[PDB]
Amino acid sequence: YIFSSDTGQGHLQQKSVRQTTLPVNIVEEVHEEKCYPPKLDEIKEQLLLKRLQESASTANRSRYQSRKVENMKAMIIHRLKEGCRLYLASDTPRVPSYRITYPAPIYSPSINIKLSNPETAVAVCNEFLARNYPTVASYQVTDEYDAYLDMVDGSESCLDRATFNPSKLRSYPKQHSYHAPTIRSAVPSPFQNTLQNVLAAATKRNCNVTQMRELPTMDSAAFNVECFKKYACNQEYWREFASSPIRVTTENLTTYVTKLKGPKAAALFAKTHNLLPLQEVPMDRFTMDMKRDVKVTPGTKHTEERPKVQVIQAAEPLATAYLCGIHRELVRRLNAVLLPNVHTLFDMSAEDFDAIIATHFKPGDAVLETDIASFDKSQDDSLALTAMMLLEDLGVDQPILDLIEAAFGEISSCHLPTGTRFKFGAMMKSGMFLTLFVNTLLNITIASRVLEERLTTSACAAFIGDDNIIHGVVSDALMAARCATWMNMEVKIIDAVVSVKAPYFCGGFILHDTVTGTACRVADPLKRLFKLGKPLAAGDEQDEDRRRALADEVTRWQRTGLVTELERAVYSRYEVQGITAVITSMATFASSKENFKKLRGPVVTLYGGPK
Amino acid sequence: PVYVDIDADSAFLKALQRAYPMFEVEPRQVTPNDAANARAFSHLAIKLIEQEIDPDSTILDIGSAPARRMMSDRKYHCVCPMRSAEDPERLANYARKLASAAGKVLDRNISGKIGDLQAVMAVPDTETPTFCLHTDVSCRQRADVAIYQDVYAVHAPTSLYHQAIKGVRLAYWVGFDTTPFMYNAMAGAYPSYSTNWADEQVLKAKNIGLCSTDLTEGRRGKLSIMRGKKLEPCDRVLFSVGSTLYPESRKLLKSWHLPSVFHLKGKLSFTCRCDTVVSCEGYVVKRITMSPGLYGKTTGYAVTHHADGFLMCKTTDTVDGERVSFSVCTYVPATICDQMTGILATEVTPEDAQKLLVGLNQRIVVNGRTQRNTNTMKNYMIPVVAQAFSKWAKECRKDMEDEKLLGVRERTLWAFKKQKTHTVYKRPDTQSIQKVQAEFDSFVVPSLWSSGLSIPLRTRIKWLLS
Amino acid sequence: DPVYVDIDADSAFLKALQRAYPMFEVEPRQVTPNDAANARAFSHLAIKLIEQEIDPDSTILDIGSAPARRMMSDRKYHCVCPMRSAEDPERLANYARKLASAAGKVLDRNISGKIGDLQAVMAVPDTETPTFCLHTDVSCRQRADVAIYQDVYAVHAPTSLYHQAIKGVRLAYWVGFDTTPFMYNAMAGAYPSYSTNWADEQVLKAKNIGLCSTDLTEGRRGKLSIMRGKKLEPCDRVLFSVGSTLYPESRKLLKSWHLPSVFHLKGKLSFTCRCDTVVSCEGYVVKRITMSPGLYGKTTGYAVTHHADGFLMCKTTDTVDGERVSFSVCTYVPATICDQMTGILATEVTPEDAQKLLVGLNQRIVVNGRTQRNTNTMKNYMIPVVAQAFSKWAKECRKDMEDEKLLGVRERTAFKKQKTHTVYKRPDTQSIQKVQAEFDSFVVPSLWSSGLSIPLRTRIKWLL
Amino acid sequence: YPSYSTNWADEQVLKAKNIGLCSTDLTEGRRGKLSIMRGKKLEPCDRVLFSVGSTLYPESRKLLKSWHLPSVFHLKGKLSFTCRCDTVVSCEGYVVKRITMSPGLYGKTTGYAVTHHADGFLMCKTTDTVDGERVSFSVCTYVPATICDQMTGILATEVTPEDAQKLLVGLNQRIVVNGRTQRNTNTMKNY
Ligand SMILES: Nc1nc2c(ncn2[C@@H]2O[C@H](COP(=O)(O)OP(=O)(O)OP(=O)(O)O)[C@@H](O)[C@H]2O)c(=O)[nH]1
Ligand SMILES: Nc1nc2c(ncn2[C@@H]2O[C@H](COP(=O)(O)OP(=O)(O)OP(=O)(O)O)[C@@H](O)[C@H]2O)c(=O)[nH]1
Ligand SMILES: Nc1ncnc2c1ncn2[C@@H]1O[C@H](COP(=O)(O)OP(=O)(O)OP(=O)(O)O)[C@@H](O)[C@H]1O
Numbered sequence A: 001y002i003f004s005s006d007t008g009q010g011h012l013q014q015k016s017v018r019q020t021t022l023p024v025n026i027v028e029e030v031h032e033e034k035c036y037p038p039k040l041d042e043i044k045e046q047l048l049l050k051r052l053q054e055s056a057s058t059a060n061r062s063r064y065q066s067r068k069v070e071n072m073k074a075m076i077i078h079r080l081k082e083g084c085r086l087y088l089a090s091d092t093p094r095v096p097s098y099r100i101t102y103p104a105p106i107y108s109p110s111i112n113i114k115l116s117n118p119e120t121a122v123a124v125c126n127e128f129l130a131r132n133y134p135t136v137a138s139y140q141v142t143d144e145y146d147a148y149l150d151m152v153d154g155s156e157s158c159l160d161r162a163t164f165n166p167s168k169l170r171s172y173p174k175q176h177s178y179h180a181p182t183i184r185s186a187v188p189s190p191f192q193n194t195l196q197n198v199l200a201a202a203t204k205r206n207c208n209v210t211q212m213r214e215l216p217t218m219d220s221a222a223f224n225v226e227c228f229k230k231y232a233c234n235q236e237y238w239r240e241f242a243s244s245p246i247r248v249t250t251e252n253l254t255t256y257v258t259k260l261k262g263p264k265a266a267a268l269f270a271k272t273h274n275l276l277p278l279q280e281v282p283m284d285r286f287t288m289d290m291k292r293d294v295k296v297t298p299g300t301k302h303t304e305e306r307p308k309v310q311v312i313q314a315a316e317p318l319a320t321a322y323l324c325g326i327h328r329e330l331v332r333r334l335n336a337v338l339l340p341n342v343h344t345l346f347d348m349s350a351e352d353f354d355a356i357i358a359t360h361f362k363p364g365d366a367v368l369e370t371d372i373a374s375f376d377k378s379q380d381d382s383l384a385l386t387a388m389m390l391l392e393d394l395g396v397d398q399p400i401l402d403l404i405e406a407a408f409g410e411i412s413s414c415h416l417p418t419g420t421r422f423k424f425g426a427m428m429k430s431g432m433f434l435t436l437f438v439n440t441l442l443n444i445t446i447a448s449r450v451l452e453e454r455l456t457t458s459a460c461a462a463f464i465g466d467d468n469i470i471h472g473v474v475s476d477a478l479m480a481a482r483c484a485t486w487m488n489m490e491v492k493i494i495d496a497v498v499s500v501k502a503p504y505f506c507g508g509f510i511l512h513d514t515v516t517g518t519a520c521r522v523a524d525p526l527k528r529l530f531k532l533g534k535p536l537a538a539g540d541e542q543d544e545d546r547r548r549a550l551a552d553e554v555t556r557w558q559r560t561g562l563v564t565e566l567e568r569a570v571y572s573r574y575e576v577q578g579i580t581a582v583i584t585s586m587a588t589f590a591s592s593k594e595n596f597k598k599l600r601g602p603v604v605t606l607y608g609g610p611k
Numbered sequence B: 001p002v003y004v005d006i007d008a009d010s011a012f013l014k015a016l017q018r019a020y021p022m023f024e025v026e027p028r029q030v031t032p033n034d035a036a037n038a039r040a041f042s043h044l045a046i047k048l049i050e051q052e053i054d055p056d057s058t059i060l061d062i063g064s065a066p067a068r069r070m071m072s073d074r075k076y077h078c079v080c081p082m083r084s085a086e087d088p089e090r091l092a093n094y095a096r097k098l099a100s101a102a103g104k105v106l107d108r109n110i111s112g113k114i115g116d117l118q119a120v121m122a123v124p125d126t127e128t129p130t131f132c133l134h135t136d137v138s139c140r141q142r143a144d145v146a147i148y149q150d151v152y153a154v155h156a157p158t159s160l161y162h163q164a165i166k167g168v169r170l171a172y173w174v175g176f177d178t179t180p181f182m183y184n185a186m187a188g189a190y191p192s193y194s195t196n197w198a199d200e201q202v203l204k205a206k207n208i209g210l211c212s213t214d215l216t217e218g219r220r221g222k223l224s225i226m227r228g229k230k231l232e233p234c235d236r237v238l239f240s241v242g243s244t245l246y247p248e249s250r251k252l253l254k255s256w257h258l259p260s261v262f263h264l265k266g267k268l269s270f271t272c273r274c275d276t277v278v279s280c281e282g283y284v285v286k287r288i289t290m291s292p293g294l295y296g297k298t299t300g301y302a303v304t305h306h307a308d309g310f311l312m313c314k315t316t317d318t319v320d321g322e323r324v325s326f327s328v329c330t331y332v333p334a335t336i337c338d339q340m341t342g343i344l345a346t347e348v349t350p351e352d353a354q355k356l357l358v359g360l361n362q363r364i365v366v367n368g369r370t371q372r373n374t375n376t377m378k379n380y381m382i383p384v385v386a387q388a389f390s391k392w393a394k395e396c397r398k399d400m401e402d403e404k405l406l407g408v409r410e411r412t413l414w415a416f417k418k419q420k421t422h423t424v425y426k427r428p429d430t431q432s433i434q435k436v437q438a439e440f441d442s443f444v445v446p447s448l449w450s451s452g453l454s455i456p457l458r459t460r461i462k463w464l465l466s
Numbered sequence C: 001d002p003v004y005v006d007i008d009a010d011s012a013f014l015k016a017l018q019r020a021y022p023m024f025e026v027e028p029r030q031v032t033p034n035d036a037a038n039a040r041a042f043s044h045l046a047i048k049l050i051e052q053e054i055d056p057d058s059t060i061l062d063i064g065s066a067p068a069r070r071m072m073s074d075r076k077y078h079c080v081c082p083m084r085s086a087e088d089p090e091r092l093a094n095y096a097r098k099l100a101s102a103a104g105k106v107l108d109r110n111i112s113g114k115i116g117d118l119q120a121v122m123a124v125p126d127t128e129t130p131t132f133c134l135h136t137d138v139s140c141r142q143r144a145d146v147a148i149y150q151d152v153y154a155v156h157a158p159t160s161l162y163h164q165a166i167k168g169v170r171l172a173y174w175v176g177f178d179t180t181p182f183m184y185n186a187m188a189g190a191y192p193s194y195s196t197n198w199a200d201e202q203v204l205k206a207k208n209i210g211l212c213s214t215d216l217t218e219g220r221r222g223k224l225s226i227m228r229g230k231k232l233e234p235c236d237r238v239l240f241s242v243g244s245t246l247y248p249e250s251r252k253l254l255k256s257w258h259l260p261s262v263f264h265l266k267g268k269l270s271f272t273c274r275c276d277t278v279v280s281c282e283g284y285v286v287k288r289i290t291m292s293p294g295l296y297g298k299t300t301g302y303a304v305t306h307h308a309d310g311f312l313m314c315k316t317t318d319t320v321d322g323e324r325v326s327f328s329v330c331t332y333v334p335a336t337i338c339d340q341m342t343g344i345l346a347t348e349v350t351p352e353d354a355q356k357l358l359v360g361l362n363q364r365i366v367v368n369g370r371t372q373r374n375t376n377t378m379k380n381y382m383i384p385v386v387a388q389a390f391s392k393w394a395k396e397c398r399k400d401m402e403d404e405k406l407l408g409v410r411e412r413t414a415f416k417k418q419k420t421h422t423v424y425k426r427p428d429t430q431s432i433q434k435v436q437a438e439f440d441s442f443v444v445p446s447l448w449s450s451g452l453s454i455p456l457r458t459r460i461k462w463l464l
Numbered sequence D: 001y002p003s004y005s006t007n008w009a010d011e012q013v014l015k016a017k018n019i020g021l022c023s024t025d026l027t028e029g030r031r032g033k034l035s036i037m038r039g040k041k042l043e044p045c046d047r048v049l050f051s052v053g054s055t056l057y058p059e060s061r062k063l064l065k066s067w068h069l070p071s072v073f074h075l076k077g078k079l080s081f082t083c084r085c086d087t088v089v090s091c092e093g094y095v096v097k098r099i100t101m102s103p104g105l106y107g108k109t110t111g112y113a114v115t116h117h118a119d120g121f122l123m124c125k126t127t128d129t130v131d132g133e134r135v136s137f138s139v140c141t142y143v144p145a146t147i148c149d150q151m152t153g154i155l156a157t158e159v160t161p162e163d164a165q166k167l168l169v170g171l172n173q174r175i176v177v178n179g180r181t182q183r184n185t186n187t188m189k190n191y
């Protein structure tokens, strides 16, 4: 997710495109990446398969999958191209674009410090938890009978416009096997797929009705786009972009499918026999998915109240494959119209982010961080109109806009195992292929309107998802009065000062180095610490990608000139002392395969076995 | 309101309030004493006792400090022999206080007290309504109430009988609980009052609460005398309350574990009872009522009710360079015992039990604040407690795989086998019963009295009272 | 009512002083950057406490005290000041200078009375005076009832106490260092809270102890000298260093003040005595002794010490004068550190691992409003030796559980003795020692001579 | 004495290469030359040169060591006196002492001197080239107290000299007192 996940896969790429070998900033030109067209070959597969049988040590098998997957990719292109005959177009001359590059970052040396006995590391971590979090360290006294306790008490829900069968509401637990954790953090296990959990998750009541597409709604949207184009964008690209539309093209589909992996291509291939046309695919029908992981934050709140259940609304598989070739062009056009001091995390890597903010943040500087998650976007219909107006200005072809618009109105969801039907009104968060883009556009628009001209005169601004940071801005009564037109809790704002109250961004800390004198971003150690106290399901063999992720994260923590700063940042955020010992404990855990085995224990089986 | 001299922020306030629901306890500290908890309980207990009885009654004090009962509204008669080193200092202190207040408080019969003291100093053998120099046997004053406060140097059946023939119908006793001494233990502790006691034979131990040892290198073989080959408790026991040392004897301690009902024969016959009124983590208050005649029958049983956890296990320690084994005992808080029942269903190693106890101990009412966070139990007794639980779980398992027939015993012709027992664990809300003696018909009096007062001491008191 | 001390405002020692004296209020006032500020603050508060409970209009005897420090007091004092140290001539001159300069301005405290008594003593050096004296503790003839000892380590306690009780003294007080480490026969020790170090005279050329000094060398593969050793045991020579001042002392006189609970004094007259401890704070103790004529009770001959902080004693290896030897070192540990190490000592820890955890646990608290953001609970120079001791303790405890005997019986051959390398007294634990409680032999030489010189007499008379 | 910009050295090592008071010249490595005298010994002599800022002072070891007086000592002659010596104020190696003298002989002496360290003190062996010839001698210096406290954890194991140098540099730069302008704020001199 964004920077890096627990398995070190992340959402960002790993190729630098914003690096230069000169001590000054240089403007360059954006180019295109050529893609190899797949080709079909059956005679090679037949002979290789027979040659696979006679001798295959290690690389002989790999040639078979590469040949087999390559055949599947060619077949998908041939079938997919025929469906969208009424929307296919050709290549028109492109509009050139330019971008700015920055010099490479400088880092301080790192020294490794670790203990020897792995059991002592567990004792230190347990001592740290008890001293700082007394209630959390005394919760576990028996096994994990959460499923049984949830069945004993009844079902409480707050639904709206839903139907279900009462005869299928039964929640007797099934077999559950896991490994007993060693760290005394009480991280819950993922929930079981039952009808009771589905109703508990859908306990949200956002029933609000306003003017759908009337005159007052249009007036608010018209003002919003005016502020965005006046305080956050330059005027050198609008007229050129309107002349050249964006349409579905063979190159878009060929490039997209080639980027998929093995298993993903096979899954898509299985749904190409009865291929519906593009105009036949419904755009307002979704399916319900439950398989998720619970989210826990440092503190003592999960030992008193049960956490919520996460859900996913999945769209049609063919809908996200026909039109997913226009995401790259939309990103390029958006980056071209933004001001040089306004940045977006799309199409960047970890190193590029460090080089941009290398010489901007210094001690004693005020930074404003604001999130917009706590806001009901379903109350006002103008939030959807504003996004469409921005999309139309960017140069989206007219019939394609109708297909996109159909997914932002009335939608329905269904649960296949139980046949449960749900209906929702205007919704912004979903599982479609424009979710981050629309959220980023709305985040910039909200900030631009509230801050007015204070956004233009700034040193560095970064926007991604629902989080943002703006340099050199404080909190005054003018923004409170402007934002209090409807209510007061639209957004949450926090004031931060470098080297005194470290700013928080995307689950990390922004710190200023001492030896070199440059800014850098590091991860959150407490978030990792609670995560090692999560039970591991039996039969899982993913205990090697996590060790490498921990090893990389530990090295970044032990850089010289950042030990003292990290201590103060954690204390000013969570009011906790003594994290250097925890970091040392993490170092010895991620040193060998056998040292990582001390975080687990004997296997415990519940609700299973007729003995 | 009742004021106690303990710290305003400590965990002992809740226990005192719960054990005395008819009062109001307010902390007010003026002295950093090392035995504040011990003195606080005694102050409350004596206030309750004097409040439960009617006024205009005469009261005897066996172990008496006259300065303590000087500003009271009751009628106390003090019995003060001269058999202790504390006695000369207390007598001089009493005289100084009396002479220092003669025209300030004319409400407690100060003039009478001074006159009675002077009369005794003239003739040592005289008896006065307030002071005397006899013992509990040689005193000849009539009353109906007797009070014992921290007395461990008398024989209970003999002392009680001599008080009955003088018209006493009620008695009170305040002191330590005598349950651990009925189990024939070697050492023990009272964590709530910072009290440690140990037998004289293990004073050179290494890892107990009252010991001292040196540093040695190690030698194989030493010169010695005829082999002992035994290690059993003796009659001498040493007590340490705070920083003060008290020697005691086992026989006189066990004599106060009186049965529910017993008879006192002899020249005159009486029937007796015994009940426990207040109990708080080691201190008890007992009430004894006596009546002439002979009624009912006796069973000779004693019952103790446990509101906390009681533990007794076997430990291995090095005494004077030699490895031996003996037994210890202690008390455990109720909350800790209640939360350990989920892990004792299986077999656990001592290391695992220790880790759970540590994590479960820092949980305190004031949470992360370390002002009132004195922990649930003292940390120096955790290692020994962890071993006891591990041994208990192992023994509770072997019983399950050796089920037998219902009703009949098994001898494999003769020589039935006995099993090992290494720990005794009494859970809260349980009772313990022992067999004792409940009939006494052997009373002897020396009938000889020797004075203990000296000439220079008498002169000093006379000068002070001048 | 408020009490002023010469202590820096934002210091960690203020909390300890407040808890030890709950009946007062303490507020700092620093005027001097002394190197032993903590040592003097305790003594100042102790004197105020002692004089508060005693009955007024009563005479008090001072043994080996400087009369200058007691001139503004509103009590009756009798100073016993012999001439046996290099400190005395300076103190006498200072006392006369202050006394002369205070005439007339202070119309109280009997200034005009004792100002004429000093010259009377100088005229004839063998006269008694209700304010001044020139004999020893066993030669003075003044009669009183209260005696006070303050930082006195050069007298034999049974002998000195008996002579004072003959004159009719029923109360005594003692203020000084704790004598517990000297009952364990240690070679070196420390008092980290008061910046005090002490070492034996045979280890003054060590390398890694509190008080030592060494030099650089290259190494000689075999050196023959005219000295024969194979012995290394404590002797009767100890050096104390408080701040920057040096004090030589002897072990025999130090152990004499570790009195039991009850003891008897038998001679021409007989008395019974008791010893209690009133105030204790990280090394300083205050003892109250009461005396009464006659024979009463019985004695057992035991001494009891109560530990509020952890007491540690271990065996260390060092290099003395180029040669490698081994001896024992003792120190004190704070209570909070000992409580947080309970869970770690259950496992097996190497000395390297134990040192790292102690350093991490040391720097803590981190007050921002008060003092500095970085604060240390204990002095850092004692961590290496402490971490070594815990490692040895954990190993010995584990080896006993793996070798359990039977209940009641001991097996002989006349038995094998195991090795012991660490003694650890946890908080809220008592230690017991055996001493002598019956004294009957007293010697009074009384060969007193006037230890005074003509030039000193002339200076005092002319200055006064 | 880094806090006062003072450097002192022996007269025999004035041609060293890497100390605070020395001077040398470039050479190519001409090997050879013969003489009659054979030194074979490098020990301190009675000639010390002091440099406070830009001013030079020559001193003698015997007179410098004569001021290290003990706690108590006696003066005997036509008249006899007894006297003491005390230290009043000290700040990074520049102290003030007080002596009180009285007539007559009292007490007894022991002949010991005590020094109290409020900050670290080092004396180590170093290797350098004096006039092109490699030799070894000893150097001493002072260390700030806060630096010594923070190095306790690292010195628990075996650490190479280069690793210790990198750690010391990182600890030297300190930021809380800079006032956002001073920036550098060196705790100790880098040389
Ligand atoms: N084992 C035993 N404990 C005693 C005895 N006398 C008193 N105690 C207890 O020891 C505690 C501390 O008493 P101290 O204050 O040190 O001695 P004290 O001179 O008797 O003064 P008070 O007990 O306050 O009257 C008391 O509270 C008693 O509970 C005794 O004779 N034997
Ligand atoms: N071991 C030992 N310690 C002493 C002795 N006398 C004093 N001390 C302690 O050392 C500390 C140093 O005190 P000083 O700085 O010398 O000042 P002082 O206490 O007013 O007494 P003076 O020596 O006269 O200056 C005192 O506070 C005592 O606690 C002694 O004779 N032997
Ligand atoms: N009949 C009695 N016999 C013995 N002591 C009595 C009696 N009556 C009162 N006392 C008091 O009991 C107290 C304990 O006296 P004891 O003979 O036991 O000497 P002790 O050894 O100092 O005390 P302990 O044995 O409890 O430690 C004395 O103060 C004594 O005045």
Ligand SMILES: Nc1ncnc2c1ncn2[C@@H]1O[C@H](COP(=O)(O)OP(=O)(O)OP(=O)(O)O)[C@@H](O)[C@H]1O
Binding pocket: C063, C064, C065, C080, C081, C082, C083, C084, C085, C086, C087, C088, C136, C137, C138, C153, C154, C155, C247, C248, C249, D107
């Ligand atoms: N028998 C004594 N009676 C009264 N005062 C004494 C006696 N002996 C020593 N003093 C006093 O002790 C004080 C200093 O101690 P001392 O006489 O032993 O000299 P010191 O050897 O220099 O110091 P230390 O006490 O460490 O041995 C002197 O002021 C002296 O008056």
Ligand SMILES: [Zn+2]
Binding pocket: B077, B078, B079, B127, B131, B132, B133, B134, B139, B140, B141
């Ligand atoms: Zn009587």
Ligand SMILES: [Zn+2]
Binding pocket: C078, C079, C080, C128, C129, C132, C133, C134, C135, C140, C141, C142
């Ligand atoms: Zn005199």
